[PDB]
Amino acid sequence: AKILAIDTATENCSVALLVNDQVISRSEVAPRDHTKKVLPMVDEVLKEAGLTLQDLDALAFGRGPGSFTGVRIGIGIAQGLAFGAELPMIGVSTLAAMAQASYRLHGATDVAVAIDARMSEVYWARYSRQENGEWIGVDEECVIPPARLAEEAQADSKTWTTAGTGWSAYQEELAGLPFNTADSEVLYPDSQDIVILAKQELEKGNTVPVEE
Amino acid sequence: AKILAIDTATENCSVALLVNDQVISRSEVAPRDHTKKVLPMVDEVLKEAGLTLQDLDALAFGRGPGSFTGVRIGIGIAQGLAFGAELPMIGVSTLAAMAQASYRLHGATDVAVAIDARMSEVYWARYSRQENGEWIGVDEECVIPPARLAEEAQADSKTWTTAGTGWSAYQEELAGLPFNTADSEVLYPDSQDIVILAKQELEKGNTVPVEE
């Protein structure tokens, strides 16, 4: 179960490595650039483990949504390094990714992810931890102006723990629909969790090739 | 002398491979995306040569200028692939790159590269082929509004073959200074030429590590 993940999707540049239920995580809440940090971290991660790229049996990545430039860049490195160790690959949703963090720290089964898209819109989904440890998609991945989100889907009555930067960027507007809600201390996805999501795609045989 | 170059700087996505004075080139005048074409080409290149990444003794890349997203993306793959074959690397100027093409087709020793920056400015340099085959930098790499370029530097009296997309996007304005000039059929850099530039950085011992 040897997986190495990269994420470059939001403000947080992160790289982590699962080697048999032992996730050594690296993170950096990043700037205008990304390249300059992503390799050295992958190097750090691996030396602190004695693995090589061809040791790993999968290479995982934030597939987005998230920043256009950024989310491309990391996929670009994630291909680069896969190609050379002949690795299969695993794309992983930034949204569901943040749902896992919300379990990891808060033990929440009910997660509402809202990522601040640019120009007045929001990347949104909701997920729901099912018995297996998986996440039933309670709402499809969308991009919506939060206003419209509020008047669509009356949906349920449940305590959704809110994650990602949509929340703090459009309160006025996400303030408008009875779902129960809870603050989260979570802003961005992290490769910590991304791995643990990827670790179950393997066990479902759900990996692409290398040129996805 | 085994070098593989990637370029993703302008509208032209290109990958080529020098294996002993034999450059098998791949090119594609590309769209809104880049990832999807860059790997397969690097794969194509290598099968039609029986080399692997760890066969090569350097991996080169367009360092830019050029499109922000683009130029990051290629650099991102060119690190990814370097890292896994433990390769040294070689960044290469898109401008001087296009100077080489202008030799390759037209045999020009006097090149004026102007790339259409966005928002009313231009990426510009001038190079001059010295006896060795190197290129004296007749003007430092810049980013100027073409207007200002015209009234700066009276400079010389010589026949500069113009390349890159500045020329056709600001004629009125680049039309204003006596240098002699000649049309070129050249618009973007190509990994064809990038390699032959890289092949000489090696011979000067001028390669960075892998996390440049």
Numbering used by the authors:
A (entry chain D), B (entry chain A): 2 to 213
Q: What do the authors report?
A:
The yeaZ gene product forms part of the conserved network YjeE/YeaZ/YgjD essential for survival of many eubacteria. and V. parahaemolyticus (C. Thomas, personal communication, 19 November 2010) demonstrated that among other as yet unidentified roles, YeaZ functions as a resuscitation promoting factor required for cells to be able to survive in, and exit from, a VBNC state. The structure of VpYeaZ confirmed that it is a member of the ASKHA superfamily of actin-like nucleotide-binding proteins characterized by two domains (I and II) that hold a nucleotide-binding site in the interdomain cleft.
The structure of VpYeaZ has been solved to 3.1 Å resolution revealing a two domain architecture with a duplicated βββαβαβα secondary structure. The asymmetric unit contains four subunits, each comprising residues 2–213. The 19 C-terminal residues are missing, most likely having been proteolytically removed during crystallization. Remarkably, YeaZ appears to be unique amongst other members of ASKHA superfamily in that it lacks these inserts; the lengths of loops β3α1, β4α2, α2β5 and β3′α1′ in VpYeaZ do not exceed five residues. Analysis of the packing of VpYeaZ monomers in the crystal lattice identified an obvious dimer with 2-fold symmetry and approximate dimensions of 30×45×80 Å. The dimer interface is formed by residues from helices α1 and α2 from both subunits, which form a 4-helical bundle. The dimer interface in this form shields 9–10% of the monomer surface area and buries a region of strongly conserved hydrophobic residues L40, L47, I74, I78, L82 (VpYeaZ numbering).
